[PDB]
Amino acid sequence: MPNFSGNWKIIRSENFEELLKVLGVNVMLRKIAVAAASKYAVEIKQEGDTFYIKVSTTVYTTEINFKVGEEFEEQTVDGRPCKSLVKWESENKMVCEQKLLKGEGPKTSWTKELTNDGELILTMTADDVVCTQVFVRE
Ligand SMILES: *C/C(=C/c1ccc([N+](=O)[O-])cc1)C(=O)OC
């Protein structure tokens, strides 16, 4: 039955560079990151409130495993390790708040949503900056 589960391919990416900028990434690396972001591919397996998510680009791949309501460890977009906790906001929207394991830095979070016309929308936030990325099913 249709939920977040599936193979998703990015179709749009808005404010990605500004987000990296807030996270301290210098301009040459941001431009390379933006170019890599146009091959983002996401594989999701969902069962009840347990998720497996694999995000990959051309040269890199990451997997996360979590259950809504339970703390897990992952990393911020710029690769600093964090403690994360996901909660539902509605039937097909979830929101994750992150806290840095070490150090200080911008407040980051992310949301994912299945829309009514079949898209997966990711938002990623750092302080005041919101990146939106839109995916469709492969
Ligand atoms: C689901 C998900 C997707 C994602 C897209 C892009 C990046 N990124 O490093 O640019 C990370 C993840 C996610 O949970 O990431 C927050």
Side-chain angles (χ1 to χ4, degrees), residues 1-38 40-44 46-82 84-101 103 105-106 108-127 129-138:
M1 219 147 165
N3 54 19
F4 283 88
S5 280
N7 296 295
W8 297 94
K9 61 183 198 199
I10 192 170
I11 56 150
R12 264 220 296 303
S13 182
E14 167 189 319
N15 290 341
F16 189 52
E17 179 168 8
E18 294 80 340
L19 177 89
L20 297 178
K21 189 176 187 178
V22 155
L23 294 171
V25 183
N26 293 336
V27 53
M28 173 284 287
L29 289 177
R30 304 193 300 262
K31 299 302 191 175
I32 279 70
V34 172
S38 88
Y40 272 131
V42 176
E43 176 199 4
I44 301 183
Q46 171 194 4
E47 268 190 291
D49 63 6
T50 296
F51 287 79
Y52 159 88
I53 303 173
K54 185 178 93 207
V55 182
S56 56
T57 57
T58 300
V59 305
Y60 207 81
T61 184
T62 298
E63 282 171 324
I64 65 174
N65 289 271
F66 65 84
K67 169 192 195 358
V68 172
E70 311 200 342
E71 188 154 337
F72 64 104
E73 295 197 354
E74 64 172 346
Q75 54 223 331
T76 69
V77 170
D78 73 305
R80 310 172 64 179
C82 63
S84 289
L85 177 61
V86 170
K87 296 175 185 213
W88 299 106
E89 252 193 46
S90 54
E91 177 173 4
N92 296 305
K93 182 157 177 146
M94 62 197 15
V95 53
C96 184
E97 307 274 28
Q98 296 177 324
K99 300 180 208 156
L100 283 168
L101 282 199
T108 62
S109 66
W110 58 256
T111 75
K112 270 166 144 51
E113 168 169 24
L114 237 188
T115 69
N116 284 124
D117 52 30
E119 290 183 328
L120 161 74
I121 303 180
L122 166 78
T123 81
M124 286 172 305
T125 300
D127 293 339
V129 174
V130 182
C131 171
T132 300
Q133 297 190 331
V134 176
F135 297 72
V136 295
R137 297 198 180 269
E138 262 173 29

